Design a protein around this motif. Sequence first.
Motif, PDB file in Angstrom:
ATOM      1  N   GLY A   1     119.905  21.911 141.294  1.00 28.54           N
ATOM      2  CA  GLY A   1     121.220  21.739 140.722  1.00 28.54           C
ATOM      3  C   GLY A   1     121.776  20.393 141.146  1.00 28.54           C
TER       4      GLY A   1
ATOM      5  N   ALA B   1     113.452  24.694 141.553  1.00 27.12           N
ATOM      6  CA  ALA B   1     114.841  24.824 141.108  1.00 27.12           C
ATOM      7  C   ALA B   1     115.670  23.666 141.639  1.00 27.12           C
TER       8      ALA B   1
ATOM      9  N   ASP C   1     124.900  28.054 140.315  1.00 25.47           N
ATOM     10  CA  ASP C   1     124.506  28.220 138.924  1.00 25.47           C
ATOM     11  C   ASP C   1     125.107  27.136 138.025  1.00 25.47           C
TER      12      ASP C   1
ATOM     13  N   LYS D   1     123.017  24.059 138.639  1.00 25.65           N
ATOM     14  CA  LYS D   1     121.707  24.203 138.002  1.00 25.65           C
ATOM     15  C   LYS D   1     121.768  23.937 136.503  1.00 25.65           C
TER      16      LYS D   1
END
Length: 268
Positions: free
Chosen positions: A207, A205, A184, A187
């Motif tokens: 990161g 997605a 997270d 990201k």
Amino acid sequence: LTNLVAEPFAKLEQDFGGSIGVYAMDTGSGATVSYRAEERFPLCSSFKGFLAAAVLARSQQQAGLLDTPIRYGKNALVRWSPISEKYLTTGMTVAELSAAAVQYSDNAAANLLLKELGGPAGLTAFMRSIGDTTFRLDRWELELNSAIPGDARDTSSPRAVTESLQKLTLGSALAAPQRQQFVDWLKGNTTGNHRIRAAVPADWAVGDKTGTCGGYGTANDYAVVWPTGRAPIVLAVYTRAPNKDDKHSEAVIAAAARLALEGLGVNG
Ligand SMILES: *C(=O)N1C[C@H](NOS(=O)(=O)O)CC[C@H]1C(=O)NC1CCNCC1
């Protein structure tokens, strides 16, 4: 399964005026794209992702660590401390410093967290503990950015970066809650929009963590990418160049990332 399809990295780096190192891994098949992947390149700010992972690993045995408030003085605020300068008069938690180091590349935050781990050698030890024998951190911010040709201090290889990133974000090197926290933070990075992310479709997605040493054309990015409908891809793109005044290029990093995805046959 390495370099099933050749890609024109040599022309890319020649036009850039330096060297580009790329490792990319399709975690489904194990196929890879690899170019200068075992050469050393300066980490620059990119060590800060691994730093946050090391803090998360420590937090597995120290349930209060992330919420611990850290106070610091004005002397801690070296160049590029955009978050920690706003909390000088209040302090920040270890988790907040970690998020700042990852997502804003905050230098004071990175130094404060290095201190928590026992310095550059402590971060190096964490990397050894996950099986990375290449990574070395030697100095603190800002000295680690010197990027001197041939100097191994504060370097790793694209391959070892990718391998370690895979272990930490997708493998078992972190416990599951900490693994997701690391993902997270990556990201939410704000500094990478013109690098690997520029090569990644908006509906995937992703990161990442960037680095930019400020000399010798030296800059980088590494990322974990989740294309829809297939397994994740891990990749690292590092650059350097022979002359002190050679400038880095974000476009070159994005272009190298595109070639890597093309080499893996990932439709993007
Ligand atoms: C990291 O390499 N940094 C921190 C910050 N942003 O990181 S980045 O990955 O988004 O580039 C700014 C540049 C760099 C850094 O610490 N540079 C030093 C301070 C400014 N003078 C040059 C060296």
